[PDB]
Swiss-Prot record, chain A:
The modification (Microbial infection) Deamidated glutamine is found at residue 40. It comes from the Eukaryota. Belongs to the ubiquitin family. SUPFAM superfamilies: Ubiquitin-like. GO terms for biological process: anatomical structure morphogenesis; modification-dependent protein catabolic process; protein localization; protein modification process; protein neddylation; proteolysis; regulation of postsynapse assembly; regulation of proteolysis. It comes from Homo sapiens (Human). The record marks 8, 44 as: Interaction with UBE1C. The gene is NEDD8. This is Ubiquitin-like protein NEDD8.
Curated annotation (Swiss-Prot), chain B:
It is found in: Cytoplasm. The C-terminal TRIAD/RBR supradomain is essential for ubiquitination activity. The chain holds residues 1871 to 2158 of 2517 of the full protein. This is Cullin-9. A zinc finger (RING-type) spans 153-195. Belongs to the cullin family.
Length: 76, 233
């Protein structure tokens, strides 16, 4: 199942996921094409920060639904 | 990418820190070995790149000072094949007020969509046009982040029929005219005591909608956005 992640500037990235994938796995797939350690990345969905431990199915994420990426350099 | 590497490198040294050219040497060595342990991310950096990125970081207040040291309310920045662009190393340009208003409006609109426009502008002002770290705290917790902005007629003793203060428009217009005219519309709130209310300017526009008042409010927002951007002058 293929979803999207949008950075702050507007650049879009397209990533295929599975229902058992962890938020850490999604961060890894993002840094595959971004090379940014997960300590600095943050994922936002419906105004709520993605919990790293949780699974992609926990937030009931569907295909195409954009999980907005945001940077956090200070933390980490 | 250069900035994230820099912030990690400077986070590693605590209060021991490093010299400016020492930090330059470390980042240059890292990029020479490359952040790639990839090809989507990784061009050759120069000392100009290091100085530019550390200028941005200094503007973000993350570095303090010949000595250079790591740090822990402040200002923010506007923040506005592949080898073809990469070879073009260079990158300040001059903006016009119309363009400034356009970019500010677009930014506030996009951040509002990320999370109503009036509350968005109010909160952005509350952080002095700060980074989305305010939104990050919001996602961490709403209550204090909201509290940052705090989000007969009594004033007009002449009686008339009918933030928890539904007062007549006459005294509201008087207060708004006093604040805007005195150029003190910064941090507008309900004059009734213990009523710190983040003012939706549209509601304030309902309080008074004079064509000169519109010019005053537009000029005030322009000045406020300009004064809180770390790069503008
Ligand atoms: Zn009144
Ligand atoms: Zn009040």
């Amino acid at each position: 199942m293929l979803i999207k992640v949008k950075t702050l500037t507007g650049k879009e990235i397209e990533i295929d996921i599975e229902p058992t994938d962890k938020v850490e796995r999604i961060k890894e797939r993002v840094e595959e094409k971004e090379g940014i350690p997960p300590q600095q990345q943050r994922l936002i969905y419906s105004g709520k920060q993605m919990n790293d431990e949780k699974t992609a199915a926990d937030y009931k994420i569907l295909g195409g639904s954009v999980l907005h990426l945001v940077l956090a350099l200070r933390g980490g | 990418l250069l900035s994230c590497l820099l912030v990690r490198i400077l986070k590693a040294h605590g209060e021991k820190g490093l010299h400016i050219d020492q930090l330059v040497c470390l980042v240059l060595e890292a990029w020479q070995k490359g952040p790639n342990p990839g090809h989507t991310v990784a061009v050759a950096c120069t000392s100009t790149d290091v100085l530019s990125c550390i200028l941005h970081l200094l503007g973000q207040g993350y570095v303090k000072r010949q000595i250079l040291m790591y740090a822990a309310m402040g200002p923010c920045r506007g923040q506005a094949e592949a080898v073809a662009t990469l070879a073009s190393l260079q990158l300040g340009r001059t903006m016009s007020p119309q363009e400034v208003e356009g970019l500010m409006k677009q930014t506030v609109r996009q951040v509002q969509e990320t999370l109503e426009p009036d509350v968005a502008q109010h909160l952005l002002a509350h952080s002095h046009w700060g980074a989305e770290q305010l939104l990050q705290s919001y996602s961490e917790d709403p209550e204090p982040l909201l509290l940052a902005a705090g989000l007969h007629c009594p004033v007009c003793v002449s009686p008339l029929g009918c933030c928890m203060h539904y007062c007549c428009k006459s005294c509201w217009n008087e207060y708004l005219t006093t604040r805007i005219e005195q150029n003190l519309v910064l941090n507008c709130t309900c004059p009734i005591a213990d009523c710190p209310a983040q003012p939706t300017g549209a509601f304030i526009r309902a309080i008074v909608s004079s064509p000169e008042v519109i010019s005053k409010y537009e000029k005030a927002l322009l000045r406020g956005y300009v004064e809180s951007c770390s790069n503008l002058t």
